[PDB]
Amino acid sequence: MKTRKGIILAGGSGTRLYPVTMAVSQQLLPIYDKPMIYYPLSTLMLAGIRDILIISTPQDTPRFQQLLGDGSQWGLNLQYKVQPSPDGTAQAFIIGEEFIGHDDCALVLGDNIFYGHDLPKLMEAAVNKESGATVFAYHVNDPERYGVVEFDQAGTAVSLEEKPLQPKSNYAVTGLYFYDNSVVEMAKNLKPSARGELEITDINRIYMEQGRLSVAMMGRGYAWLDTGTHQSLIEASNFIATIEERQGLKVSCPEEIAFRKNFINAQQVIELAGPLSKNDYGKYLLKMV
Amino acid sequence: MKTRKGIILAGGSGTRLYPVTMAVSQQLLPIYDKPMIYYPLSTLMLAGIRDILIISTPQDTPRFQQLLGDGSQWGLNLQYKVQPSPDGTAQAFIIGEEFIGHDDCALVLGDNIFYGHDLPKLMEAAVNKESGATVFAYHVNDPERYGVVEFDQAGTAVSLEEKPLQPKSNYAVTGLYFYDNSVVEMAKNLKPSARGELEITDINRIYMEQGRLSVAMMGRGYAWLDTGTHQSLIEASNFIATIEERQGLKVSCPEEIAFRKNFINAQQVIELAGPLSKNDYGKYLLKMV
Amino acid sequence: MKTRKGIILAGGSGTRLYPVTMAVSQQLLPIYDKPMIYYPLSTLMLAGIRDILIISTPQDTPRFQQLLGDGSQWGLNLQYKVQPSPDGTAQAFIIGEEFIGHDDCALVLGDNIFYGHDLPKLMEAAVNKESGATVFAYHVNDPERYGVVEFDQAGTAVSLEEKPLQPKSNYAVTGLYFYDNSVVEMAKNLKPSARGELEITDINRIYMEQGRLSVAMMGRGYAWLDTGTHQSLIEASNFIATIEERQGLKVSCPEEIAFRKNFINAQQVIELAGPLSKNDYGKYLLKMV
Amino acid sequence: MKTRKGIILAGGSGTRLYPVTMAVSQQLLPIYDKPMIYYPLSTLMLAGIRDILIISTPQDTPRFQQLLGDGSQWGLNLQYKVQPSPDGTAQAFIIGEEFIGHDDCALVLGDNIFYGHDLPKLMEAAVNKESGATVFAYHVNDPERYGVVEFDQAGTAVSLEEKPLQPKSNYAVTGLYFYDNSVVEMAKNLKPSARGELEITDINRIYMEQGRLSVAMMGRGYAWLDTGTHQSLIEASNFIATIEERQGLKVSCPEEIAFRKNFINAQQVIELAGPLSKNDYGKYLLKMV
Ligand SMILES: Cc1cn([C@H]2C[C@H](O)[C@@H](COP(=O)(O)OP(=O)(O)OP(=O)(O)O)O2)c(=O)[nH]c1=O
Ligand SMILES: Cc1cn([C@H]2C[C@H](O)[C@@H](COP(=O)(O)OP(=O)(O)OP(=O)(O)O)O2)c(=O)[nH]c1=O
Ligand SMILES: Cc1cn([C@H]2C[C@H](O)[C@@H](COP(=O)(O)OP(=O)(O)OP(=O)(O)O)O2)c(=O)[nH]c1=O
Ligand SMILES: Cc1cn([C@H]2C[C@H](O)[C@@H](COP(=O)(O)OP(=O)(O)OP(=O)(O)O)O2)c(=O)[nH]c1=O
Ligand SMILES: Cc1cn([C@H]2C[C@H](O)[C@@H](COP(=O)(O)OP(=O)(O)OP(=O)(O)O)O2)c(=O)[nH]c1=O
Ligand SMILES: Cc1cn([C@H]2C[C@H](O)[C@@H](COP(=O)(O)OP(=O)(O)OP(=O)(O)O)O2)c(=O)[nH]c1=O
Ligand SMILES: Cc1cn([C@H]2C[C@H](O)[C@@H](COP(=O)(O)OP(=O)(O)OP(=O)(O)O)O2)c(=O)[nH]c1=O
Ligand SMILES: Cc1cn([C@H]2C[C@H](O)[C@@H](COP(=O)(O)OP(=O)(O)OP(=O)(O)O)O2)c(=O)[nH]c1=O
Numbered sequence A, B, C, D: 001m002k003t004r005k006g007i008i009l010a011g012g013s014g015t016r017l018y019p020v021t022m023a024v025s026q027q028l029l030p031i032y033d034k035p036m037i038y039y040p041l042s043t044l045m046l047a048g049i050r051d052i053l054i055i056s057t058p059q060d061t062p063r064f065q066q067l068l069g070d071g072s073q074w075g076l077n078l079q080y081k082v083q084p085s086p087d088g089t090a091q092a093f094i095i096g097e098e099f100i101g102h103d104d105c106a107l108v109l110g111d112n113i114f115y116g117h118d119l120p121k122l123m124e125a126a127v128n129k130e131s132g133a134t135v136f137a138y139h140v141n142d143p144e145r146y147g148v149v150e151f152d153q154a155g156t157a158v159s160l161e162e163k164p165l166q167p168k169s170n171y172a173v174t175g176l177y178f179y180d181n182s183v184v185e186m187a188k189n190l191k192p193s194a195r196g197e198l199e200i201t202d203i204n205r206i207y208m209e210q211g212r213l214s215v216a217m218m219g220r221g222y223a224w225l226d227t228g229t230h231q232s233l234i235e236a237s238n239f240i241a242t243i244e245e246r247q248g249l250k251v252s253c254p255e256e257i258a259f260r261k262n263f264i265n266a267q268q269v270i271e272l273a274g275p276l277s278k279n280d281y282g283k284y285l286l287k288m289v
Helices: A038-046 A061-068 A089-095 A119-128 A183-189 A200-209 A230-247 A254-260 A266-276 A280-288 B038-046 B061-068 B089-095 B119-127 B182-188 B200-209 B230-247 B254-260 B266-276 B280-288 C038-046 C061-068 C089-095 C119-127 C182-188 C200-209 C230-247 C254-260 C266-276 C280-288 D038-046 D061-068 D089-095 D119-128 D183-189 D200-209 D230-247 D254-260 D266-276 D280-288
Strands: A005-009 A051-056 A077-082 A105-109 A112-115 A133-139 A147-151 A157-162 A171-179 A213-217 A223-226 B005-009 B051-056 B077-082 B105-109 B113-115 B133-139 B147-151 B157-162 B171-173 B176-179 B213-217 B223-225 C005-009 C051-056 C077-082 C105-109 C113-115 C133-139 C147-151 C157-162 C171-173 C176-179 C213-217 C223-225 D005-009 D051-056 D077-082 D105-109 D112-115 D133-139 D147-151 D157-162 D171-179 D213-217 D223-226
Touching: A005 A038, A005 A089, A038 A105, A038 A112, A038 A119, A038 A171, A038 A254, A051 A061, A061 A077, A089 A105, A089 A183, A089 A200, A112 A171, A112 A230, A119 A133, A119 A171, A119 A213, A133 A200, A147 A200, A157 A200, A171 A200, A183 A200, A200 A213, A223 A230, A223 C230, A230 B230, A230 C223, A230 C230, A254 A266, A254 A280, A266 A280, B005 B038, B005 B089, B038 B105, B038 B113, B038 B119, B038 B254, B051 B061, B061 B077, B089 B105, B089 B182, B089 B200, B113 B230, B119 B133, B119 B176, B119 B213, B133 B200, B147 B200, B157 B200, B176 B200, B182 B200, B200 B213, B223 B230, B223 D230, B230 D223, B230 D230, B254 B266, B254 B280, B266 B280, C005 C038, C005 C089, C038 C105, C038 C113, C038 C119, C038 C254, C051 C061, C061 C077, C089 C105, C089 C182, C089 C200, C113 C230, C119 C133, C119 C176, C119 C213, C133 C200, C147 C200, C157 C200, C176 C200, C182 C200, C200 C213, C223 C230, C230 D230, C254 C266, C254 C280, C266 C280, D005 D038, D005 D089, D038 D105, D038 D112, D038 D119, D038 D171, D038 D254, D051 D061, D061 D077, D089 D105, D089 D183, D089 D200, D112 D171, D112 D230, D119 D133, D119 D171, D119 D213, D133 D200, D147 D200, D157 D200, D171 D200, D183 D200, D200 D213, D223 D230, D254 D266, D254 D280, D266 D280
Parallel strands: A005 A051, A005 A105, A051 A077, A133 A213, B005 B051, B005 B105, B051 B077, B133 B213, C005 C051, C005 C105, C051 C077, C133 C213, D005 D051, D005 D105, D051 D077, D133 D213
Antiparallel strands: A105 A171, A112 A223, A133 A171, A147 A157, A147 A171, B105 B176, B113 B223, B133 B171, B133 B176, B147 B157, B147 B171, C105 C176, C113 C223, C133 C171, C133 C176, C147 C157, C147 C171, D105 D171, D112 D223, D133 D171, D147 D157, D147 D171
């Protein structure tokens, strides 16, 4: 079963970014030339995933709904569900249980930006996996802040620890995950962690203890950025800016990926571009077709 | 009469930043570690202006309201009014006619960021002017995009042109203006320009024609940035970031300015800083007191 | 024959960066934490090319020499030759005629920075080509500034134009080229272009006309930057900085690449890293081993 | 006696920037669009100082000499003297003793960038002081790395400590200093510090113990940047870039300051611009006149 459903966890508190995130959701913040949520959404789209459930806070869910709509304009089927309280990323599978049904589902954090040659290829391997789960390991400078994966001599993943005091490696689990349908039952039975939250890491550990976790390496050639701090938020923006300025191509443009993957055709693009042709984004879409 | 009233024009369509401004108000977009509106707000605070009316769109006006409230926490008196449609910047004085009354009133654009040694001294001079109006002239690289002020050989402001195809100089009129009570009567009788908008420049031309306009020069030693383009918004953030990182001091932090100007006491600061201590912002205010 | 020889063209007038290039060679300018030449040098190292000739101006050639020496510390064999005057990039093969001999030879511009997942795999394919030549096509925002490659409806490279007034496409030819021995004979018989310079593009057109040119596409997933302008040089540095900061890994560090490719052992690394431990650079290599 | 002599200490080791500073002096590195040394030189020029002694290493002194010449082109009188070994900034007065004679002299570190409205004014006060010394205090985030100044209740400087473990404040002494002629005798008798170097800080302490030190406050409105680390070097570049891009005015352009201060007239500017008009710097100079 190809993973055809996905979830974007665009809620949270964003205390690290106050007061910036006091009146503006972290996932609505701009990462250079477009709202942050366009990045994780693009990643799902590039995986061939069109049916997406967007989860956010009670106050912000309607805003992402106003920004994205039902997604038909990009040939997508977007749905929205509120997460009452930020009680853990794993809760996404409890909230989106109905949305998932008996199918497989991907989950990507709303503030995660993925960029790199052959990124679609790497995900497709996970999209096609008949069962189990697929997570990605990425070398970072401060692994303690993330879910760290320990590898043995042969280079095989053996354990996972959420924000360990002493990381057993510098490889963090990224915020993009692909699960089979058994994820829902795991989430429903998960107990609050040591930090009072239902962590996705605990789900990844269950898949691993059952020998069903594939820890796909995401090399240094790829870019995996986070936007939880003032510093990182601006670093990611400069990053994307350098790339787009040089290439004359936008990174993660929903309209462009929709067109290139045939979710919509040229006429639709032209119709969308027209009313926006007055600005650069519109001109970008027109040049594309 | 010392100017004690100010108006922050925080609306507009903001079509140039599309799509970042599709889900979040431009004046709420972050400039490194704080909402864009904190900057022009700080400018008025530094000018001694505490009674401030915030005008935004019908959709966003309530958002600024939820973010800032009546402003009493910073020893300010904030009021809010909606601008049905972006009919023009000069329309701010018609909308705020009741708020202004018979008093003098300053106007600052919600996306204007001012910074430089003696800035307070600069505004102070314009704030104490008995009558007339005061605008500032800043040397910019792209004059065509703003109100341009031409000078005669003696170096005296002789004319003002809104977005001239052939700028008569590289000095633009910034978005910080100090007017006397007569400004209300002018805006009320203003006729829409060729572009169907009530131009603030027209107001300024009227003051000039009446020999009541002081065009204060704002030297290159000062920094004046607006966020018209994605590229400019990110440079604005890098600018503020380098400064703050280096000095270990924040730029345009309302809580700090309210405190250093004795608008509020150390106890009020500690209370407002409590929820914001998850990051440097709140810890900063704590150390400040 | 596996391409084992490479030439790094590190000269030129560099008049566009004036005055930064008035006292220091452009290829010695820093890109965040290391000299610009370390990047193209790393590209050749990653392509398996260890015998490298560095061509620069009569003034700078000796400077690269003092910086890198014979390159044996990185398990390389570096040679140096002077380019009297910047008569053209294709002149590299006349100057390096003795160095090349009867072998194949790669050419990379001293100011070219390549980065991306599978980059080594990309070059590997061109390095193992029996005969012919291999260049790469990259989508850029300003094609007019480089050799442009046009494609027919079937998507096949049909022509090459040096700095066309009317680019036939947005794909530029990067400064990394893989040629067979016949390149020497071509450059020797090349006549200066309209701008009085021996164009590398002419060489490439000759390979195309002989049906021996492979135009490999270099996707948007890859990053290709040159330092033609002050603005580009700084974006290049921010790009590398964000990446290194995030991964806790360095981009194009010769010592590291020489080590991971077994060009040198851990003992050689420790020795070269000793003097460089006053900053992250040397400490990095230490932790690496 | 108006301070009419100055010294630029453009030597040092720059170990923190290896290998960037292995073949390129730190003061030759680019700070966006021009070599680092243009900044401290500009500061001296803005102080009305034309007779300047440039001190550097034995290998780099001739390079600054090749970049600047005798300075007659900018209406200056530049001299050069080598500092055999980086034995301390205070040694600058031993090396330049002959250059100083019986006159007053300013000293600015070669990697110090000063920017801010009314910066010339602040220096002129020090330039006119009949005797004693003038140093500047600046609020920084990491004072331990600099010479820290302690102030009492009234806000009067009382002590100075070079790189104290526990700074008595967050105010660092900048790298710009103005001394009367007694500085030479102090330097000749200075004993190596606790770190085996003749520190300028010890000279500042002697002036203070004699009640002849003026610690001029340099507020947050000013920008004082250092370029000793990879991070700071790029932060300063982005800073200057944002300013120049917005204003269309260059920060610290020797040719421009020379013209504006009448060291040279328009004809000279035109003659200098002509041969450089092909690049942006030349066009900048032409637009200026
Ligand atoms: C936990 C948790 C996170 N998030 C999503 C939001 C984020 O994009 C992503 C990770 O952000 P996180 O930074 O780990 O949580 P946060 O957004 O509240 O930031 P802070 O720690 O400063 O308070 O996960 C939720 O939507 N719901 C949750 O219950
Ligand atoms: C290995 C290695 C690669 N590179 C750069 C070259 C390429 O542009 C980019 C990616 O090439 P690759 O390394 O092969 O891509 P990767 O994602 O597989 O990296 P890894 O599995 O080792 O984490 O990394 C270096 O600069 N230094 C190195 O030591
Ligand atoms: C016109 C107009 C502008 N603005 C404020 C919004 C901005 O902060 C400030 C800047 O002037 P403008 O730049 O013209 O504001 P804008 O958003 O209309 O420009 P654009 O759509 O091209 O991006 O003026 C209003 O609030 N109301 C108005 O009627
Ligand atoms: C004039 C002039 C100033 N400066 C920098 C030095 C100071 O840090 C900063 C401000 O000092 P001043 O220039 O004298 O202050 P200003 O902003 O009033 O100058 P102006 O009226 O010409 O706009 O400008 C230059 O770099 N080049 C110049 O040609
Ligand atoms: C032409 C020519 C270029 N170059 C190398 C230098 C650069 O790294 C690379 C880039 O191509 P160019 O950009 O044309 O090099 P350039 O320095 O002549 O360009 P400009 O003066 O406008 O800044 O080519 C030479 O070494 N020798 C040459 O004869
Ligand atoms: C195509 C396409 C890719 N991507 C980003 C996603 C990946 O991180 C990165 C590279 O994945 P891929 O695009 O599939 O690798 P590529 O460089 O070969 O693509 P192309 O041949 O079209 O140049 O590009 C977009 O954001 N938008 C797009 O329209
Ligand atoms: C000490 C000392 C510094 N310097 C000048 C060079 C610098 O611009 C300035 C301060 O730089 P410093 O950073 O304090 O010394 P440095 O340039 O050797 O850098 P590092 O500590 O990483 O080795 O003083 C000298 O020229 N001679 C000296 O004897
Ligand atoms: C004080 C104070 C100033 N400012 C900004 C406003 C001005 O653009 C800039 C400089 O105004 P001024 O503060 O008066 O300039 P200054 O160099 O004298 O600062 P100080 O003596 O306090 O160190 O600082 C703030 O943002 N917050 C503050 O709390």
